[PDB]
DNA sequence: GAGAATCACGCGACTTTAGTCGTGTGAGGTTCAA
DNA sequence: GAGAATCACGCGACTTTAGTCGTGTGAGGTTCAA
DNA sequence: GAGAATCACGCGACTTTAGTCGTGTGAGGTTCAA
DNA sequence: AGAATCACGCGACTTTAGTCGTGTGAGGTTCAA
């Protein structure tokens, strides 16, 4: 026999002047020519640089994984932080700082680019789209 | 007793000049003073207005539910479509058009506002943050 | 602050439940015979058996060499019993309705003697465990 | 335009004579009259009893939480283990053993029942139903 | 004041030989929601 | 590439009185992965 | 052998004043998939 | 007894009205998605 039940859960979302939000993004990008250079101290240095850039731009880093040829970040941002801006900030500044800190990168990357010119980004929720859709439907009546 | 099986999962994404993406947002906002005015043809008129605005701004509507005192939207956008810009377009233009199309709203909303000044927005994924974090960890 | 999430369930005399199973089984020898009208007939037969046994079919997909079913059941409906009901009866009926199946299946079996079954929930196990901790 | 992504992910499953399966259940039940007696050593004793019964019956305990007035179990079973049978084994035997081990429970429960006569049970999967259905479509 | 999953009473099966499971039904009997 | 879920043979229960479920075991007998 | 996200060349905008983002196009120039 | 929500201030820009951006404070159409 059909029976709708309910569950109570604590809602911990971020608040701002005229907005309440919870915005997370899975951002991915590769090394130019997919060169496997992000290893050892180079990988460690990149993490420090990224976390610094994130802090400077008020971006919260949830998850950061550096693979030899690409990076995976899960960031939390405000509604005012446009995607292209923070991607540029992260990739552009890190490329600059990385070449300075690790000139040896120029051995495989002498064309003036550390990163692939493309980025991959997906919105991330705690639960799923389908689950959110049911929540919305349950709001009627 | 267990054996590790593995399956293939499909994921629909969009492509642009220098980016691959899948961006969806759950946007919510209420009626000013939380007045239950979004009912009957008022609600239907709002849906038509919102879909028009969305289409004009190149925003894909995944879900649109209009409750008496608030609206729930699920939108799909490009990386170049900033949040405040589309929220403004949606709320601002709809408030204007709604008052012109349904002047009777002024009975309970005479202060020049149809919408509460605040909006609530959440990023949306087909998989859970936990699942995604597990995926990331499996390199 | 607080959010009220919905959860659809069923009720019986002394129990509240939500039981769904993803059931899978293949054709004997993995022959690709479930095509065209044979596939359509199978679906009719399976829905009928499901109805006769009070099993709700949520999803059903018939591939040339195997079947996928997502069923809803009561706590009292034991797995082996409904799997037997679905496979045994469908095998019988299919052979009568489609004697052409005997071309590649003459040994008296339409189905592989094994079945695959997984329990299914609306939320992941991880989500459920998180809810459990919040109690 | 669109881009179609495909990711590979693991899935644990058990094998038996004529079946391959992964069956988990979230079982819940409350104390009779919802009395908050499952505390301290009483709660601890219950856990030992439940794990013993589960082991005696070949049921694997994935998660077990004992609140003052109810119990949450996440069990893993074979296709042959019928729900009513294992619910009876767990609640019935624990009620019996608990009263003998902790006679003090009789203070609030003198009617011969430790448990509410009802039980709640849900099938559990590692992935969500929507994802599973989505998979079924991909084949 | 009143229903059920939850309270109470009936019943059969079966382990735990007590106190659940299966189960129909009604009333103020230790209950009020996981 | 031979072991099993899947092939084969045995067994009892029970619906579909055929061909599954329950089940142990071994060989080359229509199989090869959902 | 030849397309783009990824390789290359064009182009503003703006930080990191270098090397991204925005962006159109095309060719065998350090690339081949998160 | 505060703020997201109520009110008053303020540019920017569409919808030239009523949002977005935004700081502050008072009790003045509000009380939670
Ligand atoms: Mg670029
Ligand atoms: Mg605002
Ligand atoms: Mg079998
Ligand atoms: Mg009972």
XYZ file of C-alpha atoms (C1' of nucleotides) and ligand atoms in Angstrom:
693
model
C 0.000 0.000 0.000
C 1.499 3.286 -1.244
C 2.908 5.328 1.626
C 4.930 8.534 1.535
C 7.400 8.848 4.397
C 9.667 11.738 5.276
C 13.178 12.114 6.613
C 14.618 15.107 8.433
C 18.215 16.141 7.784
C 20.402 19.070 8.902
C 20.775 21.650 6.127
C 24.252 23.226 6.148
C 24.378 25.589 3.143
C 26.387 28.787 2.634
C 24.767 32.202 3.066
C 25.522 35.600 1.594
C 23.849 39.015 1.427
C 20.921 38.094 -0.835
C 21.545 34.416 -1.524
C 21.842 30.967 0.011
C 23.924 28.461 -1.939
C 25.942 25.248 -2.181
C 28.072 25.346 -5.317
C 30.684 22.713 -6.070
C 32.470 21.924 -9.318
C 34.588 19.043 -10.530
C 37.291 20.703 -12.627
C 39.746 18.717 -14.759
C 42.596 19.772 -17.066
C 45.657 18.138 -18.625
C 49.303 18.947 -19.275
C 50.073 20.229 -22.789
C 50.841 17.258 -25.134
C 49.745 15.126 -22.154
C 53.358 15.043 -20.963
C 53.628 13.087 -17.734
C 55.629 15.730 -15.863
C 53.547 16.251 -12.699
C 55.577 13.886 -10.515
C 57.590 14.040 -7.301
C 58.413 17.500 -5.968
C 56.837 19.000 -9.109
C 53.451 17.566 -8.114
C 53.899 18.770 -4.524
C 54.867 22.265 -5.657
C 51.819 22.435 -7.937
C 49.497 21.575 -5.028
C 50.996 24.384 -2.938
C 50.589 26.822 -5.821
C 46.993 25.756 -6.516
C 45.953 25.981 -2.852
C 47.530 29.451 -2.697
C 45.699 30.659 -5.811
C 42.478 29.182 -4.446
C 42.973 31.004 -1.131
C 43.772 34.293 -2.900
C 40.540 34.001 -4.887
C 38.388 32.757 -2.020
C 37.858 29.330 -3.563
C 37.519 26.399 -1.185
C 39.362 23.260 -2.273
C 37.370 20.146 -1.352
C 39.461 17.629 -3.243
C 42.732 17.915 -5.157
C 44.421 15.084 -6.997
C 47.489 15.592 -9.177
C 48.232 12.887 -11.731
C 51.432 12.879 -13.840
C 49.503 14.246 -16.847
C 46.362 15.944 -15.434
C 44.700 17.511 -12.401
C 41.365 16.857 -10.655
C 39.888 19.538 -8.380
C 36.558 19.737 -6.576
C 35.976 23.391 -5.663
C 33.312 25.200 -3.679
C 32.481 28.730 -4.809
C 30.078 31.650 -4.378
C 27.391 32.556 -6.958
C 29.545 35.534 -7.985
C 32.585 33.494 -8.962
C 32.190 32.844 -12.695
C 33.709 29.630 -14.057
C 35.989 31.057 -16.803
C 37.495 33.488 -14.276
C 38.513 30.886 -11.708
C 39.699 28.434 -14.352
C 41.902 31.140 -15.874
C 43.142 32.090 -12.397
C 44.006 28.497 -11.482
C 45.563 27.367 -14.759
C 47.138 30.650 -15.905
C 48.793 31.634 -12.621
C 49.901 28.061 -11.871
C 51.546 27.753 -15.311
C 53.480 30.989 -14.730
C 54.575 30.088 -11.177
C 55.386 26.481 -12.102
C 57.792 27.408 -14.927
C 59.540 29.875 -12.608
C 59.817 27.372 -9.737
C 60.629 24.442 -12.027
C 62.499 25.667 -15.150
C 63.340 22.011 -15.875
C 59.781 21.766 -17.230
C 61.000 23.634 -20.302
C 62.827 20.467 -21.361
C 59.542 18.902 -22.479
C 57.475 22.083 -22.630
C 59.343 24.846 -24.448
C 56.405 26.214 -26.431
C 55.326 28.484 -23.588
C 52.424 26.329 -22.370
C 52.227 24.057 -19.353
C 48.520 23.250 -19.765
C 46.259 21.866 -22.487
C 44.119 24.823 -23.712
C 40.922 22.943 -22.775
C 39.226 22.315 -19.418
C 36.467 19.962 -18.289
C 33.939 21.022 -15.667
C 30.851 19.488 -14.041
C 28.463 20.750 -11.367
C 28.374 18.618 -8.223
C 25.609 18.023 -5.683
C 25.633 16.026 -2.437
C 22.665 13.956 -3.592
C 21.542 13.348 -7.197
C 19.512 15.162 -9.829
C 16.845 12.449 -9.695
C 16.698 12.689 -5.881
C 16.492 16.491 -6.073
C 13.660 16.150 -8.600
C 11.672 13.989 -6.163
C 12.267 16.492 -3.377
C 10.903 19.229 -5.620
C 7.801 17.183 -6.482
C 7.217 16.455 -2.786
C 7.031 20.187 -2.123
C 3.547 20.421 -3.644
C 0.670 19.896 -1.200
C 33.096 -14.879 -1.065
C 32.982 -11.641 -3.059
C 34.353 -11.029 -6.556
C 34.891 -7.569 -8.050
C 32.758 -6.990 -11.159
C 32.983 -3.748 -13.151
C 30.379 -1.965 -15.277
C 30.368 0.772 -17.917
C 28.602 4.040 -17.087
C 27.586 6.558 -19.810
C 27.701 10.302 -19.143
C 26.168 12.909 -21.457
C 28.232 16.081 -21.675
C 28.370 19.158 -23.873
C 31.267 20.526 -25.900
C 32.274 24.046 -26.822
C 35.355 25.630 -28.412
C 37.815 25.030 -25.570
C 35.794 23.153 -22.953
C 33.800 20.005 -22.173
C 31.031 20.449 -19.586
C 27.833 19.329 -17.830
C 26.501 22.124 -15.666
C 23.109 22.100 -13.964
C 21.714 24.293 -11.194
C 18.806 24.002 -8.798
C 17.512 27.563 -8.517
C 14.884 28.469 -5.941
C 13.290 31.791 -5.012
C 10.149 32.884 -3.224
C 7.350 35.392 -3.597
C 7.868 38.638 -1.660
C 6.373 38.338 1.871
C 5.871 34.658 0.914
C 2.411 35.445 -0.436
C 0.649 32.504 -2.029
C -0.193 34.195 -5.324
C 1.282 31.744 -7.853
C -1.897 29.774 -8.545
C -4.262 29.006 -11.413
C -3.533 30.893 -14.627
C -1.063 33.104 -12.742
C 1.174 30.057 -12.277
C 0.722 28.963 -15.912
C 1.526 32.454 -17.161
C 4.712 32.466 -15.101
C 5.840 29.156 -16.617
C 5.377 30.570 -20.138
C 7.300 33.713 -19.206
C 10.173 31.795 -17.589
C 10.536 29.373 -20.517
C 10.623 32.345 -22.883
C 13.291 34.116 -20.836
C 15.271 30.889 -20.525
C 15.101 30.290 -24.285
C 16.159 33.872 -25.031
C 19.149 33.485 -22.719
C 20.061 30.068 -24.078
C 19.296 28.342 -20.772
C 17.921 24.807 -20.933
C 15.047 24.126 -18.539
C 15.290 20.623 -17.085
C 12.629 21.074 -14.405
C 10.165 23.860 -13.597
C 7.750 23.672 -10.691
C 5.725 26.625 -9.488
C 4.389 26.436 -5.953
C 1.938 29.041 -4.552
C 4.738 30.883 -2.716
C 7.956 29.844 -4.521
C 9.601 28.525 -7.677
C 11.922 25.583 -8.266
C 14.030 25.413 -11.400
C 16.633 22.974 -12.659
C 18.687 24.583 -15.434
C 21.465 23.462 -17.760
C 24.029 26.098 -18.816
C 27.378 26.762 -20.505
C 30.528 27.664 -18.514
C 30.192 31.221 -19.840
C 26.733 31.827 -18.338
C 27.320 33.482 -14.943
C 24.796 32.847 -12.150
C 23.759 36.401 -11.052
C 23.267 37.295 -14.718
C 20.728 34.551 -15.418
C 19.092 34.868 -12.001
C 18.525 38.572 -12.691
C 17.224 37.865 -16.201
C 14.807 35.255 -14.850
C 13.526 37.057 -11.724
C 13.739 40.649 -12.950
C 12.095 40.217 -16.346
C 9.450 37.805 -15.023
C 8.497 40.203 -12.207
C 8.054 43.006 -14.768
C 6.066 40.884 -17.251
C 3.949 39.233 -14.551
C 2.762 42.555 -13.156
C 1.782 43.737 -16.654
C 0.029 40.468 -17.567
C -1.652 39.995 -14.172
C -2.234 43.469 -12.626
C -4.357 41.815 -9.904
C -1.101 40.785 -8.193
C -0.834 44.402 -7.014
C -3.606 43.654 -4.502
C -1.120 41.864 -2.247
C 2.112 43.172 -3.777
C 1.947 46.951 -4.115
C 5.548 47.667 -3.110
C 7.019 47.158 -6.581
C 8.370 43.642 -5.876
C 6.946 40.266 -6.865
C 10.004 38.331 -5.687
C 11.852 37.979 -2.382
C 15.253 39.728 -2.845
C 17.105 36.475 -2.127
C 17.715 33.391 -4.247
C 18.959 29.897 -3.399
C 21.187 28.030 -5.835
C 22.856 24.588 -5.775
C 25.111 22.813 -8.273
C 23.599 19.523 -9.502
C 25.217 16.255 -10.623
C 23.762 12.925 -11.810
C 26.099 11.104 -9.398
C 26.739 11.990 -5.746
C 29.655 14.064 -4.482
C 30.781 10.906 -2.628
C 30.663 8.808 -5.803
C 32.593 11.500 -7.664
C 35.227 11.656 -4.934
C 35.598 7.889 -5.145
C 35.961 8.154 -8.920
C 38.638 10.839 -8.561
C 40.554 8.655 -6.098
C 40.606 5.743 -8.563
C 42.801 7.938 -10.822
C 18.771 24.531 8.804
C 16.519 21.488 8.211
C 15.314 19.703 5.075
C 12.473 17.194 4.753
C 13.351 14.543 2.178
C 10.635 12.218 0.807
C 10.892 8.418 0.827
C 8.236 6.295 -0.859
C 7.276 3.071 0.935
C 4.587 0.407 1.237
C 2.696 -0.768 4.313
C 1.382 -4.151 5.353
C -0.083 -5.604 8.543
C 3.064 -5.703 10.663
C 5.616 -4.069 8.373
C 6.700 -1.018 6.398
C 8.928 -1.722 3.380
C 10.419 -0.783 -0.006
C 11.861 -3.838 -1.723
C 13.203 -3.703 -5.256
C 15.360 -6.243 -7.032
C 17.385 -6.075 -10.218
C 17.080 -9.599 -11.644
C 19.019 -10.896 -14.644
C 19.217 -14.198 -16.476
C 20.473 -15.395 -19.828
C 19.263 -17.726 -22.538
C 20.807 -21.211 -22.348
C 24.116 -21.387 -24.331
C 23.755 -17.600 -24.624
C 21.946 -17.995 -27.960
C 20.643 -14.705 -29.345
C 17.032 -15.774 -29.878
C 15.058 -13.091 -28.029
C 14.400 -10.873 -31.065
C 11.387 -9.479 -32.903
C 8.036 -10.954 -31.921
C 9.800 -13.548 -29.738
C 11.043 -10.698 -27.532
C 7.618 -9.030 -27.534
C 5.885 -12.263 -26.618
C 8.324 -12.808 -23.759
C 7.467 -9.404 -22.316
C 3.739 -10.207 -22.390
C 4.369 -13.529 -20.684
C 6.653 -12.036 -18.014
C 4.205 -9.227 -17.166
C 1.443 -11.805 -16.909
C 3.391 -14.048 -14.512
C 4.390 -10.965 -12.515
C 0.734 -9.937 -12.273
C -0.377 -13.442 -11.292
C 2.184 -13.431 -8.479
C 1.647 -9.874 -7.310
C 5.073 -8.650 -8.424
C 5.329 -5.087 -9.648
C 7.472 -4.640 -12.741
C 9.359 -1.344 -12.559
C 11.638 -1.925 -15.550
C 11.982 -4.694 -18.126
C 14.401 -4.910 -21.013
C 14.794 -7.959 -23.220
C 18.071 -8.333 -25.079
C 18.696 -11.056 -27.698
C 20.539 -13.269 -25.202
C 19.394 -12.074 -21.728
C 16.755 -10.295 -19.625
C 16.841 -7.419 -17.154
C 14.002 -6.909 -14.678
C 13.565 -4.423 -11.858
C 10.803 -5.764 -9.587
C 9.090 -4.557 -6.448
C 7.882 -7.096 -3.879
C 6.611 -7.651 -0.352
C 8.720 -9.014 2.548
C 6.912 -12.316 2.196
C 7.868 -12.921 -1.433
C 11.014 -15.054 -1.316
C 13.568 -14.627 -4.093
C 13.936 -18.266 -5.216
C 10.149 -18.586 -5.431
C 9.633 -15.620 -7.737
C 12.696 -16.398 -9.872
C 11.369 -19.939 -10.395
C 7.934 -18.520 -11.240
C 9.365 -16.080 -13.784
C 11.920 -18.342 -15.504
C 10.205 -21.727 -15.262
C 6.794 -20.573 -16.456
C 8.203 -18.267 -19.133
C 10.313 -21.128 -20.526
C 7.288 -23.409 -20.761
C 5.020 -20.800 -22.334
C 7.663 -19.496 -24.726
C 8.346 -22.945 -26.196
C 4.621 -23.536 -26.803
C 4.049 -20.088 -28.283
C 7.291 -20.091 -30.306
C 8.197 -23.689 -31.300
C 10.850 -22.231 -33.639
C 13.008 -21.800 -30.500
C 13.697 -25.539 -30.622
C 16.059 -24.977 -33.558
C 18.873 -23.931 -31.259
C 17.333 -25.066 -27.931
C 16.345 -28.709 -28.263
C 17.677 -29.850 -24.888
C 14.548 -28.808 -22.978
C 15.939 -25.526 -21.647
C 15.225 -21.966 -22.682
C 17.208 -20.450 -19.788
C 20.696 -20.614 -18.327
C 20.294 -22.393 -14.899
C 21.717 -19.386 -13.012
C 20.279 -16.027 -12.134
C 21.841 -12.766 -11.059
C 20.110 -10.608 -8.476
C 20.884 -7.365 -6.664
C 18.901 -5.436 -4.063
C 18.042 -1.865 -5.106
C 17.422 1.387 -3.207
C 16.595 4.968 -4.223
C 19.645 6.234 -2.292
C 23.145 4.732 -2.374
C 24.384 2.547 0.471
C 26.735 5.384 1.470
C 23.823 7.828 1.723
C 21.882 5.347 3.836
C 24.832 4.880 6.181
C 25.151 8.663 6.527
C 21.455 8.907 7.430
C 21.927 6.089 9.946
C 24.684 8.039 11.728
C 22.432 11.111 11.984
C 19.716 8.746 13.347
C 27.494 19.890 -29.396
C 27.489 16.766 -27.236
C 30.268 14.479 -25.957
C 29.610 10.963 -24.700
C 31.774 9.921 -21.765
C 32.191 6.371 -20.469
C 33.676 5.589 -17.067
C 34.615 2.184 -15.647
C 33.760 1.378 -12.032
C 33.853 -1.731 -9.756
C 30.932 -3.599 -8.130
C 31.167 -6.331 -5.459
C 29.125 -9.535 -5.910
C 28.881 -12.982 -4.357
C 28.553 -16.285 -6.166
C 26.700 -19.421 -5.132
C 25.810 -22.681 -6.876
C 23.214 -21.342 -9.303
C 23.214 -17.629 -8.560
C 25.335 -14.455 -8.518
C 24.066 -11.799 -6.086
C 24.550 -8.689 -3.909
C 21.689 -8.432 -1.434
C 21.680 -5.897 1.362
C 18.790 -4.769 3.533
C 18.302 -1.847 5.880
C 16.304 -3.320 8.757
C 14.835 -1.123 11.499
C 12.708 -1.890 14.568
C 11.804 -0.119 17.808
C 11.541 -1.017 21.478
C 7.957 -1.759 22.625
C 6.170 1.499 23.745
C 9.258 3.234 22.344
C 10.878 3.083 25.783
C 14.428 4.437 25.775
C 16.094 1.450 27.446
C 18.866 0.582 24.967
C 21.633 2.466 26.756
C 24.967 1.745 28.429
C 25.742 -1.922 28.978
C 22.242 -2.895 27.827
C 22.980 -1.480 24.374
C 26.387 -3.186 24.376
C 24.874 -6.534 25.325
C 22.322 -6.198 22.513
C 25.105 -5.681 19.944
C 26.871 -8.865 21.080
C 23.606 -10.826 20.884
C 22.639 -9.461 17.453
C 26.105 -10.166 15.998
C 25.984 -13.691 17.415
C 22.535 -14.375 15.929
C 23.601 -12.888 12.610
C 26.675 -15.139 12.606
C 24.645 -18.219 13.592
C 22.418 -17.540 10.573
C 25.144 -16.617 8.108
C 23.990 -13.011 7.806
C 26.738 -10.422 7.438
C 26.401 -7.224 9.448
C 27.517 -4.256 7.399
C 26.285 -1.594 9.832
C 24.657 -1.767 13.257
C 23.554 1.209 15.315
C 21.622 0.930 18.543
C 19.705 4.008 19.613
C 17.944 4.215 23.017
C 14.570 3.325 21.491
C 15.397 1.507 18.225
C 17.873 -0.438 16.089
C 19.351 0.081 12.633
C 20.951 -2.836 10.808
C 22.339 -3.086 7.310
C 22.584 -6.799 6.497
C 24.043 -8.786 3.591
C 22.355 -12.087 2.715
C 22.074 -14.901 0.189
C 19.016 -15.295 -2.087
C 17.838 -18.197 0.092
C 17.485 -16.192 3.290
C 13.888 -15.037 3.521
C 13.199 -11.706 5.222
C 10.477 -12.821 7.687
C 12.759 -15.668 8.818
C 15.801 -13.522 9.596
C 13.735 -10.703 11.109
C 12.111 -13.271 13.441
C 15.488 -14.816 14.278
C 17.020 -11.427 15.135
C 14.112 -9.815 17.067
C 12.651 -12.940 18.689
C 15.885 -14.479 19.948
C 17.383 -11.137 21.042
C 14.229 -10.311 23.041
C 14.528 -13.656 24.816
C 18.267 -13.383 25.522
C 18.037 -9.715 26.505
C 15.406 -10.292 29.185
C 17.465 -13.100 30.713
C 20.707 -11.111 30.544
C 19.156 -7.846 31.770
C 16.158 -8.618 34.069
C 16.072 -4.906 34.885
C 14.307 -4.346 31.539
C 11.187 -5.776 33.187
C 10.892 -2.503 35.148
C 9.498 -0.775 32.068
C 8.613 -3.850 29.992
C 6.608 -6.359 32.037
C 4.202 -7.341 29.261
C 6.478 -9.981 27.746
C 7.632 -7.867 24.774
C 10.973 -6.109 24.328
C 10.112 -5.095 20.762
C 7.482 -3.206 18.785
C 5.641 -5.884 16.735
C 6.444 -4.106 13.465
C 9.615 -3.913 11.378
C 10.813 -1.639 8.576
C 12.991 -3.025 5.811
C 14.397 -1.642 2.552
C 16.502 -3.209 -0.187
C 19.912 -1.511 -0.529
C 22.226 -0.988 -3.508
C 25.712 0.525 -3.826
C 24.419 2.765 -6.637
C 21.040 4.490 -6.880
C 17.914 3.146 -8.568
C 18.055 5.850 -11.254
C 21.641 4.905 -12.063
C 20.748 1.210 -12.216
C 17.801 1.936 -14.516
C 20.099 4.127 -16.632
C 22.507 1.202 -16.853
C 19.734 -1.174 -17.870
C 19.066 1.093 -20.860
C 22.711 1.156 -21.956
C 22.644 -2.689 -21.805
C -10.408 12.686 21.809
C -8.501 8.719 18.539
C -5.530 4.917 14.446
C -2.102 1.956 13.561
C 3.332 0.147 12.388
C 3.533 1.582 16.727
C -1.834 0.269 21.775
C -4.954 -4.133 22.870
C -7.009 -8.687 22.031
C -7.585 -13.172 18.943
C -5.230 -17.097 16.124
C -0.971 -20.876 14.315
C 4.044 -21.682 13.638
C 8.413 -22.073 15.699
C 12.546 -20.595 18.242
C 13.961 -17.904 22.017
C 9.530 -23.170 24.381
C 9.556 -16.993 24.972
C 8.406 -13.749 22.007
C 8.981 -12.978 17.427
C 7.082 -14.134 12.593
C 2.602 -14.975 10.003
C -2.249 -12.628 10.799
C -7.676 -9.640 11.614
C -9.634 -6.455 14.348
C -11.113 -3.066 17.754
C -10.678 0.000 21.823
C -8.728 3.314 25.429
C -5.202 -1.220 28.684
C 2.747 1.228 29.495
C 2.848 3.994 22.520
C 3.225 8.290 19.342
C 7.722 7.563 15.627
C 12.426 5.098 13.402
C 41.429 -22.328 -21.843
C 39.290 -25.009 -18.574
C 36.377 -23.908 -14.682
C 31.690 -22.677 -13.689
C 27.129 -19.102 -13.230
C 27.218 -20.211 -17.638
C 28.621 -27.118 -20.119
C 27.067 -32.126 -18.402
C 25.149 -35.530 -15.204
C 22.761 -36.794 -10.434
C 18.887 -35.727 -6.853
C 13.726 -33.655 -4.686
C 10.079 -30.057 -4.958
C 6.619 -27.964 -7.640
C 4.611 -25.354 -11.486
C 4.981 -24.650 -16.275
C 3.359 -31.638 -14.979
C 7.853 -28.820 -18.166
C 11.622 -26.679 -16.724
C 12.728 -23.793 -13.224
C 14.016 -23.566 -8.078
C 16.739 -26.114 -4.362
C 21.405 -28.870 -4.904
C 26.922 -31.734 -5.583
C 29.994 -32.848 -8.879
C 32.786 -33.784 -12.928
C 34.000 -33.791 -17.888
C 34.618 -32.349 -22.524
C 28.784 -33.772 -24.727
C 24.984 -27.020 -28.153
C 28.300 -22.164 -23.520
C 31.924 -18.291 -22.737
C 29.289 -13.642 -20.298
C 24.890 -10.400 -18.405
C 46.940 8.534 -42.328
C 44.237 13.658 -40.306
C 40.053 15.471 -36.262
C 39.820 18.112 -32.173
C 39.383 19.268 -26.357
C 43.692 17.769 -27.014
C 48.237 19.631 -32.522
C 49.011 24.480 -35.192
C 48.159 29.297 -36.736
C 44.890 33.894 -36.118
C 42.631 37.172 -32.629
C 41.467 40.770 -27.572
C 41.280 40.680 -22.451
C 43.809 40.383 -18.227
C 46.730 38.257 -14.826
C 50.595 35.419 -14.091
C 52.721 41.079 -18.027
C 53.074 35.285 -18.973
C 49.830 32.164 -20.162
C 45.343 31.336 -19.244
C 40.368 32.749 -20.523
C 37.392 34.294 -24.397
C 37.634 32.845 -29.667
C 37.784 30.793 -35.616
C 40.238 28.107 -38.389
C 43.181 24.591 -40.502
C 47.052 21.623 -41.160
C 50.738 17.425 -40.611
C 54.581 21.663 -36.474
C 56.315 18.214 -29.163
C 49.287 15.466 -28.502
C 45.897 11.124 -28.575
C 42.850 11.204 -23.554
C 41.187 12.888 -18.284
C 14.477 40.166 19.461
C 17.476 38.511 12.868
C 17.905 38.136 8.136
C 17.688 35.286 3.010
C 13.384 36.535 3.996
C 11.178 42.973 6.872
C 13.007 48.188 6.074
C 16.053 52.024 4.553
C 20.736 53.415 1.648
C 23.415 52.706 -2.856
C 24.941 51.824 -8.929
C 24.063 48.780 -12.955
C 20.865 47.324 -16.409
C 16.716 45.224 -18.163
C 11.979 44.564 -17.453
C 13.186 51.667 -17.839
C 10.664 48.335 -13.698
C 12.507 45.389 -10.582
C 15.978 42.299 -10.400
C 21.228 41.785 -9.735
C 25.279 43.718 -7.242
C 25.499 45.808 -2.196
C 25.685 47.811 3.768
C 22.941 48.606 7.334
C 19.288 48.663 10.827
C 14.751 48.705 12.729
C 10.866 47.063 13.939
C 6.661 49.306 9.363
C 2.822 43.677 4.207
C 7.733 38.276 6.003
C 8.980 33.793 8.956
C 10.738 29.650 5.181
C 11.890 27.090 0.128
Mg 41.398 27.590 -23.675
Mg 18.851 40.231 -4.361
Mg 19.295 -22.882 -11.109
Mg 5.091 -8.614 13.895
